[PDB]
Amino acid sequence: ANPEQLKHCNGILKELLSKKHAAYAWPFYKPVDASALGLHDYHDIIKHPMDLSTVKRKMENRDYRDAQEFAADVRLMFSNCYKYNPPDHDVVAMARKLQDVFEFRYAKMPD
Ligand SMILES: [Cl-]
């Protein structure tokens, strides 16, 4: 069932990247460019950066062998946001909204 489940994961990924969610998904599209943002402590705090472009590359390259591996990366991305930013920052609100999209559809995985 890993291939079918991975198609569900790819569908989720496409949805997360889609225009429908862009108002809150956009901070997660590409790796955080810490230097560009003046976040000179980012890589001291976040040991394992993750973003949707990386998830997409990994999916396209058949790196993910199962849905759980995919989910762990998407959740890592959100965790990095929750770790680095104060909980009242807009980006955290954006993360929580995108994570809600993710978790509700991931829960519908065929099995
Ligand atoms: Cl997980």
Author numbering: 345 to 455
Study authors write:
In both our apo- and the BD2-L10 complex crystal structures, the side chains of several residues are observed to display multiple conformations. Three of the conserved water molecules both in our apo-BD2 and in the BD2-L10 complex, are displaying alternate positions. In apo-BD2, the alternate positions of water molecules are reciprocated by the alternate conformations of some of the surrounding residues (N424, C425). The dynamic nature of these water molecules, as demonstrated by alternate positions, might have a possible role in facilitating the binding of Kac into the binding pocket. The binding pocket apo-BD2 residues, displaying a different conformation compared to H4K5ac complex, are mostly in the BC loop region (C425, H433, and D434). Compared to the H4K5ac complex, the C425 side chain is flipped, both in our apo- and BD2-L10 structures. In the apo-form, C425 contributes an extra water mediated hydrogen bond to N429-NH2. This water molecule is unique to our apo- structure, and it is not observed in the previously reported structures. Alternate position of conserved active site water molecules along with this newly observed water molecule, demonstrate a flexible hydration shell in the binding pocket. Overall, these structural variations together demonstrate a dynamic nature of the binding site, necessary for the activity of the BD2.
